């Protein structure tokens, strides 16, 4: 049976409007009056971050705030503005201020929490990640929160999943993982791909289920439990 349902909250439960506005506000704060378009800085930042994280995929963990600060240092040198001090504070303030959940998130977590172990699996440093979840009002809706910093490795390393399962006290066969990107297979978890806009059809085959609204998750799991 299914006894645990895991999510990737800061990555699949944050509205894209909200995620973009947070990142734009960060860029705007960094630049101040410097004569560079913040949307151009943002696009270039997302480029270098994606690249830097892929270099680390599956590797031993290194603080993500440190990696992002190197990226911003490259951008400051590239465009000529002064490297912002305390960038991690700027980012955490802007996320707590403007971060936003998809509309059905709270209802879905509250409904699962009575009958299942509800967990979060996150690739974000633990301290800022947990402060963000508190600001969003969902930290205490989770039975467990597990990060790559706790596990010691970046995805797709299985270790983060092994630890999340240990916290829930079950083997992979008893759990589902809801993510928006397709490591996790050898452990036996049931994968649900969240594809709100039907934009990742080429990756549907590598997922056991595909949804566009999180309210479909309770149905899949209630179904799987006879």
Author numbering: 1 to 182, 188 to 231
Give verbatim excerpts from the published study on this entry.
SNAr1.3 can operate at a rate of 0.15 s−1, perform more than 4,000 turnovers and can accept a broad range of electrophilic and nucleophilic coupling partners, including those that allow construction of challenging 1,1-diaryl quaternary stereocentres. Biochemical, structural and computational studies provide insights into the catalytic mechanism of SNAr1.3, including the emergence of a halide binding pocket shaped by key catalytic residues Arg124 and Asp125. In summary, we have established a biocatalytic solution to SNAr chemistry, one of the most important classes of transformations in the chemical industry.
Notably, iodide was found to be a more potent inhibitor of SNAr1.3, with an IC50 value of 1.20 ± 0.05 mM. The resulting structure reveals two internal iodide binding sites, with the most occupied site (about 85%) shaped by Met64, Arg65, Arg124, Asp125 and Pro128. Notably, Arg and Asp residues are a common feature of halide binding sites in natural proteins, despite the latter being negatively charged. Guided by the structural analysis, we performed site-directed mutagenesis of residues lining the halide binding site. R124A and D125N/A mutations led to substantial 180-fold and 68-fold/22-fold reductions in rate, respectively, with more modest 5.4-fold and 10-fold rate reductions observed with M64A and R65A. These assays further underscore the importance of the halide binding motif to efficient catalysis, although the large contribution made by Arg124 could also be ascribed to its role in nucleophile activation (vide infra). Notably, although high levels of selectivity were preserved with the M64A, R65A and D125A halide cavity mutations, the R124A mutation led to a substantial loss of enantioselectivity, suggesting that Arg124 may also play a role in positioning and/or activating the nucleophile 1 for selective catalysis. This hypothesis is supported by molecular dynamics simulations that reveal productive conformations with the enolate of 1 forming hydrogen bonding interactions with Arg124.
